[PDB]
């Protein structure tokens, strides 16, 4: 998945 803080 996307590893940023969402």
């Amino acid at each position, epitope marked *: 998945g*996307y590893p*940023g*803080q*969402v």
Partner: antibody, heavy 116, light 110 residues
Framework: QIQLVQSGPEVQKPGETVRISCKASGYTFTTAGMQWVQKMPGKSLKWIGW????????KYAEDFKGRFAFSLETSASIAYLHINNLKNEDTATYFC?????????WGQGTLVTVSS | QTVVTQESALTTSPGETVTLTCRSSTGAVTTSNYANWVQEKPDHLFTGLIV???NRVPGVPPRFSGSLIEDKAALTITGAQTEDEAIYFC?????????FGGGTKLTVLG
């Protein structure tokens, strides 16, 4: 209403340091990461990196790591971009933008002008 | 090396549908690129429109929608309004960094 409000345009000499501020409101600051973006005049946008506002850990783009650094003042809901040893090519508008994934809400932009 | 390519400019008329596209140098854009679309108006005023291919940012008019069409990401404005004249940028995620396209200047006639 979510709003990111950045410090006003700034002028510095080559070799000096600048700090760009980004004050967030309208949501819990530590629940979304903060991206930083550069737009040199007349050119496109470059991702500088993000900072995780919960853990305080940054992730940088390779071309900006080093002179560009991120910090926080979490209690104030502020994210900062620090640029040191400024160079002529750093003249640009800098934006904070909230995750995500990517760039959901944008600050108004801060134009940093490096003098001759 | 990784390059995101957008149309430099295109024109529509008010009330028509228009589609802007976003191509990747790595091959097909997929949902793993988390495609974003953002709008720039004067004076360097950026609004987020779409994130994660097709998720419209709250408060953006529903005439804006994101999708994948063939191998590209696409922004469709269904019924473009005069005030939609602006520069539209897409951004794609490539494993460990975001890359922006060069922007499309959308003209709306009239």
């Amino acid at each position: 209403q979510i709003q990111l409000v950045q410090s006003g345009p700034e002028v510095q000499k080559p070799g000096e340091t600048v700090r760009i501020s980004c004050k967030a409101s309208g949501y819990t600051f530590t629940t979304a990461g903060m991206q930083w973006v550069q737009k040199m005049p007349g050119k496109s946008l470059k991702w500088i990196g993000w900072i995780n506002t919960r853990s305080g850990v940054p992730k940088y783009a390779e071309d900006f790591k080093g002179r560009f650094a991120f910090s926080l003042e979490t209690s104030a809901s502020i994210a900062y971009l620090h640029i040191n040893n400024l160079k002529n090519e750093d003249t640009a508008t800098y934006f904070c933008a909230r995750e995500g994934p990517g760039f959901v809400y944008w600050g108004q932009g801060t134009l940093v002008t490096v003098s001759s | 090396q990784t390059v995101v390519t957008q149309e430099s400019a295109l024109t529509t008329s008010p009330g028509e549908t228009v589609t802007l596209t976003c191509r990747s140098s790595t091959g097909a854009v997929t949902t793993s690129n988390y495609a974003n679309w953002v709008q720039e108006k004067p004076d360097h005023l950026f609004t987020g429109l779409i994130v994660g291919t097709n998720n419209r940012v709250p408060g953006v008019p529903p005439r804006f929608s994101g999708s994948l069409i063939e191998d590209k990401a696409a922004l469709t404005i269904t019924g473009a309004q005069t005030e939609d004249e602006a520069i539209y940028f897409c951004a794609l995620w490539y494993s460990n960094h975001w890359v922006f396209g060069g922007g499309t200047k959308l003209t709306v006639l009239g």
